[PDB]
Design a protein around this nucleic acid. Structure first.
Ligand SMILES: [Mg+2]
Ligand SMILES: [Mg+2]
Ligand SMILES: [Mg+2]
Ligand SMILES: [Mg+2]
Ligand SMILES: [Mg+2]
Ligand SMILES: [Mg+2]
Ligand SMILES: [Mg+2]
Ligand SMILES: [Mg+2]
Ligand SMILES: [Mg+2]
Ligand SMILES: [Mg+2]
Ligand SMILES: [Mg+2]
Ligand SMILES: [Mg+2]
Ligand SMILES: [Mg+2]
Ligand SMILES: [Mg+2]
Ligand SMILES: [Mg+2]
Ligand SMILES: [Mg+2]
Ligand SMILES: [Mg+2]
Ligand SMILES: [Mg+2]
Ligand SMILES: [Mg+2]
Ligand SMILES: [Mg+2]
Ligand SMILES: [Mg+2]
Ligand SMILES: [Mg+2]
Ligand SMILES: [Mg+2]
Ligand SMILES: [Mg+2]
Ligand SMILES: [Mg+2]
Ligand SMILES: [Mg+2]
Ligand SMILES: [Mg+2]
Ligand SMILES: [Mg+2]
Ligand SMILES: [Mg+2]
Ligand SMILES: [Mg+2]
Ligand SMILES: [Mg+2]
Ligand SMILES: [Mg+2]
Ligand SMILES: [Mg+2]
Ligand SMILES: [Mg+2]
Ligand SMILES: [Mg+2]
Ligand SMILES: [Mg+2]
Ligand SMILES: [Mg+2]
Ligand SMILES: [Mg+2]
Ligand SMILES: [Mg+2]
Lengths: 386, 109
RNA sequence: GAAAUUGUUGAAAGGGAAGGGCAUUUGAUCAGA
RNA sequence: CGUGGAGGUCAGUGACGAAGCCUAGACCGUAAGGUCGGGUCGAACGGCCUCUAGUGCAGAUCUUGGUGGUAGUAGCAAAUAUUCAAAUGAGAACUUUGAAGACUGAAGUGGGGAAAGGUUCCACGUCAACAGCAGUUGGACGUGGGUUAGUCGAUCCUAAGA
RNA sequence: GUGAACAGCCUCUAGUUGAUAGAAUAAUGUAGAUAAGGGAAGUCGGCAAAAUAGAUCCGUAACUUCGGGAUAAGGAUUGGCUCUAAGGGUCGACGAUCAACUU
RNA sequence: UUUGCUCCACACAAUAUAGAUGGAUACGAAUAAGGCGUCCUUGUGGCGUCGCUGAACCAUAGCAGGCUAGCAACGGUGCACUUGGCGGAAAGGCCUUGGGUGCUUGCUGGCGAAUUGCAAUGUCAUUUUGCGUGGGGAUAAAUCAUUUGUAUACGACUUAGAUGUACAACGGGGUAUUGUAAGCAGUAGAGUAGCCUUGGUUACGAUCUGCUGAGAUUAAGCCUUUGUUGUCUGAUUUGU
């Protein structure tokens, strides 16, 4: 017989299977459509989720109840030191999809990216790319031949970039290497840009700008094995239920004589790859810029780092991207920020945000002071010091 | 790491017993101290002085002190089998406070 | 000192059973002249 | 066709190996089956003509016995709780001693008894089995020792009753 | 000891420290708990849980077989410390001396 | 690495064969239209011709194809080199230069074949592997164990570790939580009970005040570190 009362199904069938992502770095499965009249530029960037804070800004939204009024918004900080270009990959189109034809690497690779090719770095002989570096012996004839092949072919060009994880407070010490598509046409000059940027850093400000809507691609926080009640949001069974109530009561009708894929079952929760879109960049902050957390209204010479440091992350000493809201993944996790795949003109995008204040109070508790100077001013002289 | 040596350490038992079941806190402290001595002296054979066990259990099974000042002596032993011919022997230091003390080489005994 | 059941060795086969019938290939083995 | 036993016969077979058993070795019969080779084995057995029956198994939630997959799986999670060192020992989470931490908290996890048990009491030796882990320990195993009454009970009296 | 108390909790004498252990801390469980705002809208049904609770003082309805209902209902207080007052025995209106708690 | 690995050449062994036995011989498009040739004023042009299947084209003679003598002509073809170009959809092939060299059945000769006994696939191909002999080339990792917690039931995942912007244990600082530690002192303290220099002092006294936003805790999944101390070659496995 029928359900006897309609209700929407629990969970989204388009995010199946609810399995662990194959890698801690979520893959970029679609790059922005190439506009071959633009200059050559990266379509994404690699950063590390540092943590969240809150900001205050004047809302510019005509017709809204809060137009020209102050709004408090949550923001996520992604530490984004410049990424080092170490290779270029050429992609030819085939009746069986895109196919990498060849990769040309830089002559010199730092130990940060060399660690990525080693499971046991400390006891290895560090031979990686030692014979490849000899391709640059006198004139780089083999390197130029491979680049000429990429120019003669490979309708799609991607660069190999790696993070400078040594510039982050993370203990990992092993860089993250990823392919970023080069948009801005003339495949010839795509390859030329890649080669000219070999071994050179690319700053996040050359990829992303203030107010730009971007997408965050990251592996979500893992939670291990989870029951149906929290994994899928199913109704808790009554207190009277024998054999447990954090379950799904009927996992299927008699026919089909099988548990169906669409029934909620207990299993892994989290550690899934997610591509969340339309996060507006609130700040493109620079690492060398003291007063990073300052605005034109605050003027307090303070960095973006909360007092006591970002909890479980550390201090932001590099360039950072501050996006509105939250993004998938937890602190210290590598996240790929990519340009939007379409042109958003909904007046939510195209809004020019101007921060009025950035919270730098401690996230290690109910933080009361933005700066140590403010703490001193409020508290006066203590016995230990200050 | 192959000779005899005596050093005094402060073990942060608080962070090692964080979240430990109350009925297991003192035994877990004993095992954590054995692990501590093994980590520092490279000896699998760690022996605990009964006075040190008394200091561990002084305030019951769950009242282990946050910090314990210990004297660990890596000494050589000769018995039926070699079986890690070096062993560590751990004693309490009997100080008034176990705070603000660094690792020191005793250098005399 | 059987069988069920089991170990080792040897041989053989094995994409959601296995086993069987007719026929022949291949491998092993063998009688009769 | 085959089986247990019986009369006759082959002056049948056999410790120089009967019967039995094993044998993707061979032969005969359409088949029930029969025959042979090899290994194992050790004391009886077979062909034929007849006689005889407690004479042929795949089943009966068949009977007895044995054995699997499940499966090194379910599980060995109530009674607050154990820890350090030494001794013994081949072997110690579990024995002993010492130290510590705890509990029963006198309506006890204390000290005695009635019913019941019958040596479980104690000592020495001792760990194949039992103590659903272990064991050097034990209410275990082996060998011994131990229960002393004119006054405590039975014995005597009568009760319901026999 | 606390306490009205052979209640509960802690301790003394005595006894035991005997329950297979070790490492982690997923889901679902068993047992114990908490929870913003709402307050039975859940459910057959307030099942379960929560709320109340001791003592002192105040106050206590319908009905009634006049005995009860009744701890009805509904309220206030409670610690610590320093004091004060009252409540006794013996010996010869008082004097001496001694002594324990209850309000 | 009890002389390891890879490639090439040769020899010898195995190993099998979804099945060779002259050649898979390359426009595209239309089909109520085309192919080819030719011409011009170059087109959706004129003229001629073809199909009616590949029953074609190429190749094809020689002890499974031997040994030799010539003629004719600078052709055909194989081999190993060599010049250069093109081809990325799975290119791994196509085209091309020059010389060398073998054959040439384009034509004319000489020698040989037999007895596999009247047939018996009468063995001629390619697929991998091993081994030996020479030559060419290179001189790592992974896992266990330890560690991390961005992970986790266990596996798994993510990290670190052979001398350093290294790691760890403490210590320091920051951050955060709580709420003012112990100790000492006090013309504080409701007071009660003693003593006399009757304005003080003795005993007890919840509590109060000051040192004291002090003291305690703070990563166990917080941040940081000019300090102290220490650690850094254990095991197993992997070859085209
Ligand atoms: Mg419906
Ligand atoms: Mg949610
Ligand atoms: Mg029920
Ligand atoms: Mg916080
Ligand atoms: Mg916990
Ligand atoms: Mg026998
Ligand atoms: Mg058998
Ligand atoms: Mg399968
Ligand atoms: Mg019979
Ligand atoms: Mg025989
Ligand atoms: Mg058989
Ligand atoms: Mg005999
Ligand atoms: Mg019968
Ligand atoms: Mg049967
Ligand atoms: Mg039947
Ligand atoms: Mg049966
Ligand atoms: Mg049976
Ligand atoms: Mg089990
Ligand atoms: Mg159980
Ligand atoms: Mg228990
Ligand atoms: Mg035990
Ligand atoms: Mg003991
Ligand atoms: Mg109790
Ligand atoms: Mg108690
Ligand atoms: Mg006994
Ligand atoms: Mg046992
Ligand atoms: Mg045993
Ligand atoms: Mg006995
Ligand atoms: Mg008597
Ligand atoms: Mg009392
Ligand atoms: Mg609530
Ligand atoms: Mg509430
Ligand atoms: Mg209410
Ligand atoms: Mg209702
Ligand atoms: Mg309802
Ligand atoms: Mg109803
Ligand atoms: Mg109830
Ligand atoms: Mg009342
Ligand atoms: Mg009533």
């Amino acid at each position: 017989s029928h359900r006897k009362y309609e209700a929407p199904r629990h969970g989204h069938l388009g995010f199946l299977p609810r399995k662990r992502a194959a890698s801690i770095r979520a893959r970029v499965k679609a790059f922005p459509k190439d506009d071959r009249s633009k200059p050559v530029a990266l379509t994404s960037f690699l950063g590390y989720k540092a943590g969240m804070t809150t900001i205050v800004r004047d809302l510019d939204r005509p017709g809204s109840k809060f137009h020209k009024r102050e709004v408090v918004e949550a923001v996520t900080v992604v530490d984004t030191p410049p990424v080092v270009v170490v290779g270029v990959v050429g992609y030819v189109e085939t009746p069986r999809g895109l196919r990498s034809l060849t990769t040309v690497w830089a002559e010199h690779l730092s130990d940060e990216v060399k660690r990525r090719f080693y499971k046991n770095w400390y006891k290895s002989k560090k031979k990686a790319f030692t014979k490849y570096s000899a391709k640059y012996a006198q004139d780089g004839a083999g390197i130029e031949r491979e680049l000429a092949r990429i120019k003669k072919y490979a309708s799609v060009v991607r660069v190999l970039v790696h993070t400078q994880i040594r510039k982050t407070p993370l203990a990992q010490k092993k860089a993250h290497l990823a392919e970023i598509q080069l948009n801005g046409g003339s495949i010839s000059e795509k390859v030329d840009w890649a080669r000219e940027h070999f071994e050179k850093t690319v700053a996040v400000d050359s990829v992303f700008e203030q107010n730009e809507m971007i997408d965050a691609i990251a592996v979500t926080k893992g939670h291990g094995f989870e029951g149906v009640t929290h994994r899928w949001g199913t109704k808790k069974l009554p207190r009277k239920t024998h054999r447990g109530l954090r379950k799904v009561a009927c996992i299927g009708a008699w026919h089909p004589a099988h548990v169906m894929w669409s029934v909620a079952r207990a299993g892994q929760r989290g550690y899934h790859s997610r591509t969340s879109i339309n996060h507006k960049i609130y700040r493109v902050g620079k690492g060398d810029d003291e007063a990073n957390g300052a605005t034109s209204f605050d003027r307090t010479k303070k960095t973006i780092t909360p007092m006591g440091g970002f909890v479980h992350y550390g201090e932001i000493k590099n360039d950072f991207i501050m996006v509105k809201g939250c993004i998938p993944g937890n602190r210290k996790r590598i996240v790929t920020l990519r340009k939007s795949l379409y042109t958003n003109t909904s007046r939510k995008a195209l809004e020019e945000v101007s921060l009025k204040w950035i919270d730098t109070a401690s996230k290690f508790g109910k933080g009361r002071f933005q700066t140590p100077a403010e703490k001193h001013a409020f508290m006066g002289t203590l016995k230990k010091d200050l | 790491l192959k000779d005899v040596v005596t050093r005094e350490y402060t073990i942060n038992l608080h962070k090692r017993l964080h979240g430990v079941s109350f009925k297991k806190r003192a035994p877990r402290a004993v095992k954590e101290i054995k692990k501590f001595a093994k980590l520092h002296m490279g000896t699998d054979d760690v022996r605990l002085a009964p006075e040190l066990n008394q200091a561990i259990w002084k305030r019951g099974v769950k009242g282990v002190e946050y910090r314990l000042r210990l004297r660990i002596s890596r000494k050589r032993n000769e018995e039926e089998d070699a079986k890690n011919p070096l062993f560590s022997y751990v004693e309490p230091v009997l100080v008034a406070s176990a705070k603000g003390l660094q690792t020191v080489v005793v250098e005399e005994d």
